[PDB]
Amino acid sequence: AAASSSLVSESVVSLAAGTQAVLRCQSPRMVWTQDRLHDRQRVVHWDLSGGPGSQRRRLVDMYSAGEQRVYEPRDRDRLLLSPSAFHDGNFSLLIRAVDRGDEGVYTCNLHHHYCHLDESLAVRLEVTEDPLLSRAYWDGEKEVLVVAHGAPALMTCINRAHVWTDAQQVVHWDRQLPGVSHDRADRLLDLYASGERRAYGPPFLRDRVSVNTNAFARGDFSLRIDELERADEGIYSCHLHHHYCGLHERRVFHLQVT
């Protein structure tokens, strides 16, 4: 709803004059050719509330590779997920026949290991012996499912966002001179995944700054300053926005030249 997701890494760097500075900026999000299989690993798992005060229990999970997995041998074919869950975004859990051992607070949990996104939804399941009392209600914090004993139950969990169901990237380097605030940061470089570099600085610094473009393929956009003068003191920032993930990734370096 705003600058929605950021991964910020801040560091302090103090190096001697004349030494070479290496500001590491590497991320799986910075690998341009994104593997539709391994750079898109999602997982959904349904957990059941534990005992009085500890240790929730995992019931079933499934990765975007497929083939859902049940942990208890009693629930091997009575707890079912949609095999197409990651195609249409329907992560609902189906119980063939609920018993009183299924009562409790369920959570439907989503994890995007590549985008670092977590989602969780709570549904409480109540077992009644009078089938006329079956109902669902209240969403004041969560919805409650009153299910007749022995009957099948479908606990709904939907998320049709594109990140869960299935583009040139640019990495920017900024610098803040001592005394300058954050919003007055001057651009230093634009690094394109295909190798292009756009220089902004004054040639008094531009001579000693360099990057290794051959390492862009593995998502490495690190900065290198060779002959460290005191004029290099400042706050260096490496920022990237990943459109598919909706994610800002930012690395901050407080550089100091002794």
Curated annotation (Swiss-Prot):
The modification Phosphoserine is found at S194. Keywords: Cell adhesion, Cell junction, Cell membrane, Cell projection, Cytoplasm, Disulfide bond, Glycoprotein, Immunoglobulin domain, Membrane, Nucleus, Phosphoprotein, Repeat, Signal, Tight junction, Transmembrane, Transmembrane helix. One of its GO terms (cellular component) is nucleus. Glycans are attached at N90. It is a single-pass type I membrane protein. One of its GO terms (biological process) is cell adhesion. It is found in: Cell membrane; Cell junction, Tight junction; Cytoplasm; Cell projection, Cilium membrane. Residues 1-258 are extracellular. Widely expressed (at protein level). Highly expressed in brain where it localizes to the glia limitans, which is formed by the endfeet of astrocytes surrounding capillaries, and beneath the pia mater (at protein level). In lung, detected in epithelial cells of the bronchus (at protein level). Expressed in intercalated disks in the heart (at protein level). Detected in pancreatic alpha-cells in the islet of Langerhans (at protein level). In kidney, found in the brush border of the proximal convoluted tubule (at protein level). Induction: Disruption of the blood-brain barrier by cold injury results in a drastic reduction in expression. Up-regulated in primary chondrocytes in response to BMP2 and PTHLH/PTHrP. It comes from the Eukaryota. The keyword Signal applies. Disulfide bonds join C25-C108, C157-C238. Residues 1-128, 131-258 form the Ig-like V-type domain. A motif (RGD 2) lies at residues 218-220. RGD motif 2 (but not RGD motif 1) is involved in integrin ITGAV:ITGB3 binding. Homodimer in cis. Does not appear to form trans-homodimers. Interacts with ITGB3; the interaction inhibits ITGAV:ITGB3 heterodimer formation. This is Matrix remodeling-associated protein 8. It comes from Mus musculus. The lineage of its organism: Eukaryota, Metazoa, Chordata, Craniata, Vertebrata. The gene is Mxra8. The chain holds residues 29 to 291 of 442 of the full protein.
